[PDB]
Design a binder for this molecule. Structure first.
Ligand SMILES: CC(=O)N[C@@H]1[C@@H](O)[C@H](O[C@@H]2O[C@H](CO)[C@@H](O[C@@H]3O[C@H](CO)[C@@H](O[C@@H]4O[C@H](CO)[C@@H](O[C@@H]5O[C@H](CO)[C@@H](O)[C@H](O)[C@H]5NC(C)=O)[C@H](O)[C@H]4NC(C)=O)[C@H](O)[C@H]3NC(C)=O)[C@H](O)[C@H]2NC(C)=O)[C@@H](CO)O[C@H]1O
Length: 496
């Protein structure tokens, strides 16, 4: 089954409002950049972002010029003419609107509180989708808190129902309306709703893991923002998941959540697979189309794992644009972020950057010896490993933030498409390396194994193995006369 290639596409409100396909100083990446060939490399385009207003319904930003919005959306859905499998989805939320301190945060909390608020919010989603011509809904709330999860779950089940009804009413069985969400890609915030992952994923076609931003100015040691696998020399983190209200036993929590651990794309994907009820096919691995820059680093390991003096304030608080050769950083006023389109130009402008490669994490990085700078980003090369990882783990596909940041020839999107579908590309010999793998194992991804059926009346010694309820169980100590699961002495260690 074809791997999803989900491109979020962000156009700030004032760009909609001054939209033009002829002046990059105003709209850097207009829809015209997406040629028929590019439309064919995508399966989904997630227009970003819509919000949840004070009336607790899905709606465009208050300051949006509706005529221009519809014109831009129409330009996107017109791309469907070149690829019959393409879906233009819209995403609700995003960092700016929904974080704990976001401008619309309370609307998200309220929208999901009661059956009526949920019914009202859900219907507003379907109305917006039909009214503008979208093909599905992506919920990007970062992130409901533990108490808000049950309501959030109910709002998703409500949107699924309305959407499924709409697919029937519109004869869209050839391309059903879809529902997806963007999920945390790191243990830290994933722990808010982790215990109820199965219920959260059930109503979705995909869960887009934001497996990027794993590093940033908020961490004392510079690091790759999307390491595929871990590097023993890099930092490690407390496995917050071991504290989730899972109801598991110490042995289960320990085998499932080693701590500390390496914060990697691999860790997030495995953490999701460990949950019963979360099918690999619904998991989509996000990759970033931009890099993160740190200053005040020390040479030695090319800027990696070093202390730094990068401001963490959001937005950036200064006019000191220290990313050498980064024009894009000046107009957007932040030297800490740079689109891959710009990073590429920085590399060919003799600005003093050296491109390095970490064969453990399988990701590139820039180092500027003269000014002490370090940049972590992804490229066509790191995408090879991630694409193979996706195929190997049988994931749903890849997702990226965001289309508007690729170079003009669209090499990043092209590489992704190439690795999944080009008949002249073969990665059977691509060596995935020795970087650290997340070794956790849980209920949803136990090893297949065999054992003598459990025999009632039998006394089992320590470490004994038996089959029961379609699982293989192992005793934790001796003289076990109880049945598996029917006593704290047995550890479920395998399936079938
Ligand atoms: C005080 C302290 O040190 N606490 C830390 C704690 O901060 C650490 O957790 C990390 O927190 C940071 C925020 O402080 C998290 O950074 C988030 O990460 C989000 C993804 O998980 C990210 O949002 C998504 O990613 C896109 C790219 O960043 C977002 O794009 C942005 O959209 C804006 C409009 O909404 C637009 O204005 C911006 O220009 C745009 N940015 C870019 C690069 O284009 C997108 O909105 C969003 N959705 C999707 C689908 O991609 C946030 O942007 C980002 N915030 C900021 C300000 O950068 C980080 O993820 C947390 N880490 C982890 C592992 O969860 C914590 C652990 O490190 O330690 C504490 O001590």
């Amino acid at each position: 089954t074809r791997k999803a290639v989900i491109g979020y596409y962000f156009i700030p409100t004032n760009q909609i409002n001054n939209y033009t396909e002829t002046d990059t100083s105003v709209v850097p990446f207009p829809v015209s950049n997406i040629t028929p060939a590019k439309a064919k490399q995508l399966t989904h385009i997630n227009f970003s972002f819509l919000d949840i207003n004070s009336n607790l319904e899905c709606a465009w930003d208050p300051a949006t010029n509706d005529a221009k919005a519809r014109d831009v959306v129409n330009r996107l859905t017109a791309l469907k003419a070149h690829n019959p499998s393409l879906r233009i989805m819209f995403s609700i939320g995003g960092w700016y609107y929904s974080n704990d301190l976001g401008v619309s945060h309370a609307n998200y909390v309220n929208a999901v509180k009661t059956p009526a608020s949920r019914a009202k919010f859900a219907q507003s989603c379907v109305r917006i989708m039909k009214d503008y011509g979208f093909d599905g809904v992506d919920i990007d709330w970062q992130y409901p808190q533990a108490a808000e999860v049950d309501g959030f779950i109910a709002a998703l089940q409500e949107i699924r129902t309305l959407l499924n009804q709409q697919t029937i009413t519109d004869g869209r069985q050839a391309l059903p309306y879809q529902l997806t969400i963007a999920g945390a890609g790191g243990a830290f915030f994933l722990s808010r709703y982790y215990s109820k992952l199965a219920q959260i994923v059930a109503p979705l076609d995909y869960i887009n893991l934001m497996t990027y931003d794993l590093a940033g100015p908020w961490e004392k040691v510079t690091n790759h923002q999307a390491a595929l696998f871990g590097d023993a020399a890099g930092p490690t983190f407390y496995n917050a998941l071991r504290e989730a209200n899972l109801g598991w036993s110490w042995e289960e929590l320990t085998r499932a959540f080693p701590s500390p651990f390496s914060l990697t794309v691999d860790a997030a994907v495995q953490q999701h697979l460990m949950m019963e009820g979360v099918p690999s096919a619904k998991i989509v691995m996000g990759v970033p189309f931009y890099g993160r820059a740190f200053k005040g680093v020390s040479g030695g390991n090319g800027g990696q794992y070093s202390s730094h003096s990068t401001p963490g304030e959001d937005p950036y608080p200064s006019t000191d644009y220290w990313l050498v050769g980064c024009e894009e950083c000046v107009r957007d006023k932040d030297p800490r972020i740079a689109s891959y389109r710009q990073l590429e130009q920085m590399l060919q402008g003799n600005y003093g950057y050296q491109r390095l490669w970490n064969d453990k994490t399988k990701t590139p990085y820039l180092y500027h010896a003269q000014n002490g700078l370090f940049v972590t980003y992804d490229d066509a090369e790191s995408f090879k490993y991630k694409a193979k990882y996706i195929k190997q783990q049988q994931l749903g596909g890849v997702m990226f933030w965001h289309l508007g940041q690729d170079n003009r020839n669209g090499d990043l999107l092209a590489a992704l498409d190439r690795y999944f579908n080009a008949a002249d590309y073969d990665d059977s010999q691509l060596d995935m390396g020795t970087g650290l793998r997340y070794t956790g194992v849980g209920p949803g991804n136990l090893p297949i194994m065999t054992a003598p059926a459990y025999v009632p009346g039998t006394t089992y010694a320590q470490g004994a193995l038996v089959s029961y309820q379609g699982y293989v169980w192992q005793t934790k100590w001796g003289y076990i006369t109880s049945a598996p699961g029917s006593d704290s002495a047995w550890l479920k260690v395998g399936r079938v």
